[PDB]
Amino acid sequence: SQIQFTRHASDVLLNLNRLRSRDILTDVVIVVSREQFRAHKTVLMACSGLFYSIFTDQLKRNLSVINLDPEINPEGFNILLDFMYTSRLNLREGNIMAVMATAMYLQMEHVVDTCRKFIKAS
Amino acid sequence: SQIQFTRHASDVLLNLNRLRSRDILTDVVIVVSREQFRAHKTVLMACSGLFYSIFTDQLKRNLSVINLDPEINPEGFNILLDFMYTSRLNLREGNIMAVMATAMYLQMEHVVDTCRKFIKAS
Numbered sequence: 001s002q003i004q005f006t007r008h009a010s011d012v013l014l015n016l017n018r019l020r021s022r023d024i025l026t027d028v029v030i031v032v033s034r035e036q037f038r039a040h041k042t043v044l045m046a047c048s049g050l051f052y053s054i055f056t057d058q059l060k061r062n063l064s065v066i067n068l069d070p071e072i073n074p075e076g077f078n079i080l081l082d083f084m085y086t087s088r089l090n091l092r093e094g095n096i097m098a099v100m101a102t103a104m105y106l107q108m109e110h111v112v113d114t115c116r117k118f119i120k121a122s
Numbered sequence: 123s124q125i126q127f128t129r130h131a132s133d134v135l136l137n138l139n140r141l142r143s144r145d146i147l148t149d150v151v152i153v154v155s156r157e158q159f160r161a162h163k164t165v166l167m168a169c170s171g172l173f174y175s176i177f178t179d180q181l182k183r184n185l186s187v188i189n190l191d192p193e194i195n196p197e198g199f200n201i202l203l204d205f206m207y208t209s210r211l212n213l214r215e216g217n218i219m220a221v222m223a224t225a226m227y228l229q230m231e232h233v234v235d236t237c238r239k240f241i242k243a244s
C-alpha cells in the first residue's frame with residue numbers, strides 16, 4: 001500500500017555516478033592491464049557476480065585494490081563500469097566482442113544476453 | 123545511441139538494500155534517540171541534502187556515527203531510510219506529520235511535497 005516513486009532508483013544511481021566522478025567515498029581501485037578505475041564496492045557487488053563473490057568473502061572484503069585478469073580489455077571494462085552506474089550500454093560493432101567477453105568474466109548475464117541479441121541483429 | 127536497461131537502476135537499489143539487510147559494507151550508524159540504524163554513506167548522500175552536506179565535508183566524511191537531532195522521531199527516520207533503499211514510502215494518517223517533519227530535516231523535497239499532496243487529499 002506504499003506510495004511508489006518511479007524515478008527514485010534512477011535518481012539514486014545518477015547521484016552515485018556523480019560521487020564516482022568526484023571520487024567521493026570510492027573505496028576500491030580496479031586495475032585492468034595499464035588502466036585503473038575507482039569505484040564503490042557496493043555498486044560493483046550490486047551489478048557483477050564476480051565482484052559480489054569477491055567482496056562478500058571476509059578474506060577480500062577490505063581489499064582497496066583488485067587486479068583483474070590481464071587478458072581483460074580496459075575499454076570493455078570501462079564500458080561495463082559506465083553501464084553499472086548509468087543503465088546505458090554503449091554497444092557497437094567494434095566493441096561487442098570485448099564487451100561480451102568482459103561481461104561473461106564479470107558475471108553480468110543481462111548484458112551477455114543483450115550482446116547475444118546484438119549478435120542476432122548483426 | 124546507448125542501449126537503455128529500464129530495470130537496472132531498480133535492481134541496483136534492491137541489491138543495495140539486500141547488502142544493508144546483511145550489514146555488508148555499511149559504514150555508518152545513524153543514532154536517533156534510543157534507536158540505531160546502519161547504512162551506506164553513499165546511499166544517504168544520494169537521497170538526503172542533510173547527509174550529502176555532512177559527508178561531503180572533509181571534516182565529517184570519515185565519521186562512523188552520526189547523532190541526529192534528539193527531537194527526530196525514530197519511526198519517521200526508519201520510514202525515510204526504508205524509502206531511500208526501496209523507492210516506496212509508507213505514508214499513513216498516523217505517521218504523516220512525523221514523516222513530513224523528518225523529511226524536512228533530512229532535506230528530501232520530493233517526499234515533503236508528497237506529504238503536502240497527502241495532506242491535500244486528507
Ligand SMILES: Cc1cc(-c2cn(CC(=O)Nc3cc(N4CCN(C)CC4)ncc3Cl)c3ncn(CC#Cc4cnn(C)c4)c(=O)c23)cc(C#N)c1O
Binds near residue numbers: 048108110134
Ligand atoms: C543490476 C544488474 C545486476 C547484475 C548482477 C549482479 N550480480 C551480483 C548480485 O547478484 N549481487 C547481489 C545479490 C543479492 N541476492 C540475494 C538474494 N537473492 C535472492 C538474490 C540475490 N544480494 C545482494 C547483492 Cl549485492 C550478479 N551475479 C550474477 N549474475 C549472473 C551472471 C552471469 C554470467 C554471464 N556469463 N557468465 C560466464 C556468467 C548477474 O547477472 C549479476 C547484472 C546486470 C547485468 N547485465 C545488472 O544490470
Ligand SMILES: Cc1cc(-c2cn(CC(=O)Nc3cc(N4CCN(C)CC4)ncc3Cl)c3ncn(CC#Cc4cnn(C)c4)c(=O)c23)cc(C#N)c1O
Binds near residue numbers: 012167172174225227
Ligand atoms: C533520489 C532522491 C534524492 C533526494 C535528495 C538528495 N539530495 C542530496 C543530493 O542532491 N546529492 C547529490 C547531488 C549531486 N548533484 C551534483 C550535480 N548537480 C547538478 C545536481 C546535484 N551529486 C551527488 C549527490 Cl550524492 C538532496 N539534497 C536536497 N534536496 C532538496 C531538499 C529539501 C528540503 C525539504 N525541506 N527542507 C527544509 C529542505 C533533496 O531533495 C535531495 C531526495 C529524494 C526525496 N524525497 C529522492 O527521492
